Each structure stands twice: as C-alpha cells, then as structure tokens.
C-alpha cells in the first residue's frame, strides 16, 4: 500500500547539478515502477502493511517466492525515498553537528569520507548505490551495494546514499560519472543527513 | 594490445532504431574505456597477447588480481565487439540458413525465440545483456548475464546479444527498455548471426 512520495522541491530545483528532465523521469517513471512492482507482489499477503524499511530489513526471513520482488522493488522504493530527501537546492558544503563529529571520529574527517565515498561510487561496476551507513555497533561505514540492494537487510541503517545507476546521470553527464559524483556533493542536504543520523542512534 | 574495432557502418546507420549520438558515445567512450582498462591490467602479464574471446573463456583460470579486471573490462570488450557486428542498417526480418533451423528445433520457432529473448532482456534487473548462445552440446539457449559477464566463461558461445545497460538506450528511450528491445529486432544482422552460428557449429 506504498505510494509515491512527493519531492521536497521542484523537479528543476537541483539545477545545474541534476537536470530537470532526469529528476522528473527518475521520480514519475523509475520510482513509481518499483512501488507498483512491490505492491503487486505484496497484495493479499501478511506483509502488505509494513513500513518499507522494516520489510527490506526482514528480506531473508520472507518466503522464497517474495524475496526476489522485495529485494529489487522494495529495495528500489526504500533507496529512492531516502535519495530524494538527502538532496536540496540549498545543499552542499560540509556536515555539522553530530554527523560532523561522527565523521571525524569514525572515518577520519570529511576529506577522508569524501575520498572513500567517491571511491565506492566510482568502483561500483554496473548499477548500484554508494552509502554512508550506521552499523549495529553505532558506527559509520562507507559501502556500496549492487542494483537496489540496501544495507538495511545487512543490519545497517543508511543515512546518505548516491544513486549510480546510469539513469540517474546519463541524460546530463553520459559516461562521466565522476563529474556527476562531484555535482552530488554540491546538493547534499546535510541537515537531512543529520536528522537521519540522530534517528539511527 | 587490443584496439577499438571500427564499426561496419556509420554512426547514424542504425536510425531510427539506435540514435547516432549514442552509437558514437557507446563506441568511442564506453567501449574504448573497457579496452583501455583491460590493456592496463594485462600489461606485463603472460596473457597480454591472446584473442579477447579466448582470454574471457579462461577467466576462472586467471590469477586473482586479474579476474576482476578481465571479467568486467575484458567482458566489456568482447561483448561490445560482438554487438557492433550483429547490427546492420539493413537488418531485421527473420533468420535463415542453419540458425533458422536450429531456432525451430531447439527454441520452438522464431516467434518463440523472440518471446524468450524479450523476456530475458526485460527481466534483467540492473545492468546486463540478453543472449542467444550455443551450448557445449551444440544447442541454442536464450540467456541473460549481469554487468559485462559473458557466456564465454561458462562454456557457451554467444552468437547474438543485446546490451541492456542503460547507457545503450537512455538518450533516446530513457526508461522505455521494452521499446528499445522491439527496435533492436529491426536492426539485427541475421547474416552475421548465421556466420557466428556456423563457426560455433
Ligand atoms: Mn534510480
Ligand atoms: Mn554497452
């Protein structure tokens, strides 16, 4: 019974970092499709009324005939829902508050985090995501996942994510993913990232 | 070392099925990069003077440090080299010769083959390829692979392939991968596919 969340901003609010056409297609076409696909698979089951984050966390405990649809399409839903919120037309800059202090203590500083985040995003071959996550031991880790796999079913709570599927950047950047990653930094909503960190802890 | 093969046709020869801009970017940027990367990984090794298909076939026997680069970038080189040859500005229609008879005997007919090929191409979640391949027992199979994985290192010989990485279709088709798959049928060079079948025997 999931529905498409409204973006916190207009489709063209992230220019010149992300083009308006991509934001609209990514939202109304790609994200909608994940939501429709997981809704059809969950219909008539006892798992149809769970929050998306809880469902994806319990992936391995689901029946065999549901794991495929939930991993890919439920994964797509949770990941893109998070993605839209950690971007902002007034984003960029450096983190502050406790996420800054956690980045300093856990990852060795903002400059080291970006080095690791960029490497993870560049090194993901094929479709996937780069993540900053909170572990069960309440520490930050940088990681990447394939396709729509989410750190949620690995026990981690992602607080920042970058979509590196080619549909997220090909219209404006074509093959130049490093350039796209550089633009992502200019749009990161660190106030939202701080919010998610407080909740994960 | 490997070098970028010239296309058998102009960059706009496949219109209206594949756009000229994509053909140029796909060839001169994406394929070139695979070639550059696998050449760098092979430099100074005992594998630097092998045909790419032989190299990719022997993937599982390569040293650990070479398996990643050859799988992804050598796979990328082999897959795209095949791809360019099985497209044609005068393609489409139905297969003929020995591959046609094999499609009837092994796959149940051209209509059944397209049904299976389309399903494999549509259902490949993330980046990948849809394939018509010849098995070690010399029969036809429809299959799909992830990223640049090639049926070659699983013992199969691909004779026809469709790239369903989003970079292969997003500029013209955006999210409409089914539309792209339908157009691909119009551009297939079945004369080349027959040659590849005969060579696989
Ligand atoms: Mn996406
Ligand atoms: Mn390609």
Author numbering:
A (entry chain A), B (entry chain E): 2 to 202
From the paper:
Found within a gene class designated "pathogenicity, virulence and adaptation" in the annotated genome of Xanthomonas citri subsp. citri strain 306 is the sodM (XAC2386) gene, which encodes a predicted superoxide dismutase (XcSOD). Superoxide dismutases are metalo-oxidoreductases (EC: 1.15.1.1) that catalyze the dismutation of the superoxide radical (O2•-) into molecular oxygen and hydrogen peroxide (H2O2).
XcSOD crystallized in space group P212121 with two monomers per asymmetric unit. XcSOD shows the well-known fold characteristic of both MnSOD/FeSODs and presents an overall RMSD of 0.35 Å on Cα atoms when a monomer is superposed on its closest homologue, the MnSOD from B. subtilis, which was used for molecular replacement. In the case of XcSOD the two monomers in the asymmetric unit are related to one another in such a way as to present all of the hallmarks of a dimeric enzyme consistent with the SEC results and the crystallographic symmetry. Further analysis of the amino acid sequence also reveals that XcSOD has all of the residues previously identified to be fingerprints of a Mn-containing enzyme and therefore was refined as such. The Mn ion is coordinated by Asp164, His81, His27, His168 and a solvent derived ligand (HOH304). Residues which are important for defining the topography and electrostatic potential of the access channel to the metal are highly conserved and include Trp130 and Trp166 as well as His31,Tyr35 and Gln149 which participate in the conserved network of hydrogen bonds necessary for securing the metal-bound solvent ligand or superoxide. The electrostatic potential around the active site is very similar to that observed in other members of the FeSOD/MnSOD family and presents a halo of positive charge directing the substrate anion towards the active site. With respect to catalysis, XcSOD presented a specific activity of 11609 U/mg, very similar to the value of 12800 U/mg reported for Yersinia enterocolitica SodA, a tetrameric MnSOD with which it shares 57% sequence identity.
